[PDB]
Amino acid sequence: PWNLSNDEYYYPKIIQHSIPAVELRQPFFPTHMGPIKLRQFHRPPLKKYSFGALSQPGPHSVQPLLKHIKKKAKMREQERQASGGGEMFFMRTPQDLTGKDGDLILAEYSEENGPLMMQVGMATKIKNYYKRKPGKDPGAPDCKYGETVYCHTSPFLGSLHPGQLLQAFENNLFRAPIYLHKMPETDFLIIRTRQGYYIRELVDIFVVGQQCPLFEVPGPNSKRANTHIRDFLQVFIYRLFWKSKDRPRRIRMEDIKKAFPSHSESSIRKRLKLCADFKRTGMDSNWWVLKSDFRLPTEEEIRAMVSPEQCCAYYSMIAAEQRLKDAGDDEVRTAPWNTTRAFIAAMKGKCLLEVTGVADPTGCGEGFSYVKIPNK
Amino acid sequence: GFESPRPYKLTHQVVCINNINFQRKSVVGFVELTIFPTVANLNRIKLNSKQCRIYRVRINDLEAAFIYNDPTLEVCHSESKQRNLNYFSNAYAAAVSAVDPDAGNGELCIKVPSELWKHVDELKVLKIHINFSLDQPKGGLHFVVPSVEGSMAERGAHVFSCGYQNSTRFWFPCVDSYSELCTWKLEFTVDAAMVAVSNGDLVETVYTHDMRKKTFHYMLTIPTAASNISLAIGPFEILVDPYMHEVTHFCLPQLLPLLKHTTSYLHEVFEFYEEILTCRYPYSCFKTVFIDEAYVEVAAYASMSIFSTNLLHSAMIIDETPLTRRCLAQSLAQQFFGCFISRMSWSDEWVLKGISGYIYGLWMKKTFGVNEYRHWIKEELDKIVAYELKTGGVLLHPIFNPASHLHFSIKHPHTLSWEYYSMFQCKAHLVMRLIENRISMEFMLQVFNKLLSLASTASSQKFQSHMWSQMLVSTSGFLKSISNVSGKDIQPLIKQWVDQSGVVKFYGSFAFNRKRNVLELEIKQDYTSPGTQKYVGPLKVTVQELDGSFNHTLQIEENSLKHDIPCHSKSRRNKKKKIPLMNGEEVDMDLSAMDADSPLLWIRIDPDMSVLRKVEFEQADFMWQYQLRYERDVVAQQESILALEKFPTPASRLALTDILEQEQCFYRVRMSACFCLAKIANSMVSTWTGPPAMKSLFTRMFCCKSCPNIVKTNNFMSFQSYFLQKTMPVAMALLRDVHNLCPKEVLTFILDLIKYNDNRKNKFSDNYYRAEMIDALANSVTPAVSVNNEVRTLDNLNPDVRLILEEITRFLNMEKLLPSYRHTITVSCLRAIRVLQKNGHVPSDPALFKSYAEYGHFVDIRIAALEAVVDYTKVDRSYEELQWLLNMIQNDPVPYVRHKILNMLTKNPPFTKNMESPLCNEALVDQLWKLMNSGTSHDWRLRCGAVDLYFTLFGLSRPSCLP
Amino acid sequence: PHELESQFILRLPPEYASTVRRAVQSGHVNLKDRLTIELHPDGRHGIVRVDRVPLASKLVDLPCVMESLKTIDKKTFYKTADICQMLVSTEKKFIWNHGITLPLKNVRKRRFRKTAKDVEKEVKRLLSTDAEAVSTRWEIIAED
What we know:
part of a larger assembly; 3 chains; B: alpha+beta; eight-stranded mixed beta sheet; 27 helices; 37% helix; C: alpha+beta; five-stranded mixed beta sheet; 4 helices; elongated; Transcription initiation factor TFIID subunit 1 (chain A)
């Protein structure tokens, strides 16, 4: 007639990326980054086109896109109201991730090179942490973006004041305090493609403070590092087998050698040894056909193999490897594998961090340094 | 997209009922349908009607000609000499498909008059006015008329619409499909002292000009199907809910306080179902009717539910509060997702049954706790793996035979066996739990809210089905809404567990490699059994080692056998530290039984029940004892209890005794540990040291400190030591000595529990505890030592059984003067007399049970007595008792009792197909073929029960015992 | 295939920024004729022509990294591109020291931690010259 389940003795007490991002598609998640592409990591230069309308030299008209924005927003609202009116998932194609539609905000970073950084196509949430005032409080100061949550226990290193609302980017990679600023009155946003220039205005720009890392960047030559390299190569090989139209699914080796050119071909053969065999003569000659007993994994198994946040941690590791390599122990402490290990260990309560040090990304008294100190 | 199989679209229907005569069991009325033809040259219009005598039919006030034929009255011809069951199943499927409104067909074929053809070609409205009469219905409307004199309201006579699925054709002519949605206008002219409850909201109640009768007018503006329209006419006591004011509860007279106490919880069920979904309750009223001689225990129609009065309990009745509470909860879940959102075909029924069962399981989780949820999910999963390994498998969403491994056709709900229907609903809600496991629970509730919101925007339009078909769900629409809200599609999971009809069997065994510190699992599947299929997905395994609990995902492809997972340290055996558990806590474990070289304490293959599986893991006995003691999962404690019966070592006795002594264990684990301890104690006789099992523990927990053999006076206010106290002597009576006789120390203990029982002090009743005491007395009966088939008389009675017989005589006679809540002691004493007759103690005479199986008794007494008569006619090979049971199947007033007799005669058959019996005549084959063909033509549940009985007795081929 | 879109920021003089802002928020294709952008084959020089009035432009590198984030419900935000360049209109000259927001000013000089031991390319050229040579003589020197 009651509960009668002794639950207090048995049980004592989210981010959905785009379908191009969870499928690790190669424009957004690169297979190989060279040295000049690792120096320009997250700072991509303005490339000159060889073919297209902008490749011909001369003046080029920019095109306003406000009929396009409101047409796409009205179309997405029709899709949402046709599907029952709830919240929908829209980012299903690469053409959904253009800047030509939707409400864009900008997000500037305080640090030069953060320990973790999102790739194109990945999602993040805005959480407004609001500590109520002692006793009576009016309610969270309302904010245009994000959802509000009442935080008794401060997520960040410091603690919120009573009656202080702090917005923050929250995802699987990090959690970082953001601060809404209005845009300058002179700056517009030009989206250039091969066909032409397009212009939006911006009105909202956030400044992102020092990140609190939630994912540990692996070290170089680590076991997690080599495991991610092997799993990424295996996922790419499976997706090339899925893309093959031949009835015995078959791939070519130099497609994989074009994608991963730093790999020795002994490792690629090792990945193809199980699940494929090489045909030298007859039909399918010089192709790696799929074995007939091998069941090619489904889409959800391939998604469960490698996560996009592991790819971001690997990209952070190899970019920091390049920067350290170019600059000939203080710098090694500022490497993201050390700082991410230090911060995550401090969050479990293993150890403490010297908050003033050399891992400080500001170079002055502002900002923290995530390097381990003993708790004694 | 929904395209109708009918060439017309029905907009509005008026059902008017006059002259409900209770003496003659007769109704008169008319029906006026408003159809719009969608195809020109409509000519014939085909409607559904059973048992109604059609007087006249007028189309647009012009007299029309109808022809009636029902092929399901006599399925095969009387002069065909076929006697195999596959012939009858194909003929019965063809007959039900010939009256199917889900095709274009129907039983009443009305011809459009000639002058209206220019009205039907350019598609304009047609108003069909049929007037009919039910002369003495054998189905549909059930008239409960008691034989007390007085007025019909003074004796308690009432009518209600009974049946399952599309059974509204049994009391008015309609389009009896779930896809023909229309608005409704319902008028019922009843006696002035009676009330007529139906679907919609009651717009008015006018008197007749003599003021002896009154007409109830109901209107239903939400477009429902004809199959969701119901009726309950009787002298009901009305009670408005004091919390929610659109909810009225109707009971039979003199049962108002029971109704007040019973239906006092329902507002919390309403609040739950409206806060997990975000839609409010779609109908404008809710009505709960409690009736006598009900068809099912709970039926749910549009804006109405019909329960039996046997659910009504008072405040002092426990062990019935959770059952009635969950019956109310599943009726409300079917109000949301069986009556508002309806079915597009007979396929896509798994969607609605799964959503109803899944949200009812979420209600059970919030109300009774996560542990009761896990126990319920495990018992449903064990039920389905037992049924699917027994006979073929349940196929959710078939494609039109798709399932030819089973003796009936799955194309229509009225050809399904009743056990298949029950397992269908069970598998549907477990597959919905699997879809929640793949796509998280908040996205699942968003799917359900999107379906409800499309239906409620659809429910307010007036367009005749341009938009009213958004209230009908399909499989493709459900999967598309899932893909809309989540971005993942579940098509491999749908392809495996819905379209394929099988469960998986796992045989696991491990070996610990000490050199490389790995755990080599060996998981092999039995995929060649008739009910099984092959699993190739991922599989979770949880290993508890000394460093904690770690989860691993294994990829079990077809050629896979050995899975090497890594193991952690054993440094919590170097120092005594606490070993951390599955939750955040940690405990002190006695590591003396563990191996020195292996760190791992226990292994669980598929802990979260994420597949439809049956696991057979080979651990060591100390690992099962550690899993029984220190696990924080009730299904793992239950499976360790189930696996400790094979290891009768005294460490397992210590493990189960420590579980029994332990409060803060879930109570249904201790109730299982009682029976496991009884089995282990029976297996280690000539080794057992002290007293019998659980006796000292019973005197420590439930008896006085100063008197060990006097039980404490009954205080049942804890509800967990009440259940454990009433289950411990029932398991204690299964103790046996070296001579295979129950010891006289346990029988004397049970008799002293019966004598010293004092219940004048608790606020709860004692009927279930005393009934369990009679069950414990019945468990102690061992077979008697008859010499030379000596007649069992009173002098050569066992000295043990004379005390038992005196006690059950005293209990049954005292029940005749001071009755229990639902005659629980009558049921227990009849069951115990059948136990004494099954052994050689009481003479094998069915006359007592034949007197308790008469019509005027309570239905629990009736089904207990009929169970005893079925067991007697199985053991004594009685011909006249089988003819008595078949006659009672043919003409009994209560149809639930007829269904239960067919069910019990299927479960405990008098003979199987392998047996040579004296009861294998051509006469019995002809009687059962006549019972399948004719005779059971009015119920759709007696006919499937007769098909099940013919399959159990004679098999799928030609009855062998025949020329 | 798909090519990642390349977004940059255009900074205009304030009166010309007001005319361009009014023409953007109006939304006609009249703005398309009025505003043109010609990028010179230097790669770091241009003209932006507002209402057919030429303005001199430089494509500069920004000290921080910005990211455009689109949304449909204003609760979940999807990263669309990385912005690192600005075509201000009116090498060391092509590097901007300040950030776009008001708190970030003199970020490169003050709020950026500097770690030090073009130069690599010069070393490669020196190695190539040594290879094309015959005899190489080297000495770490002193003041001379």
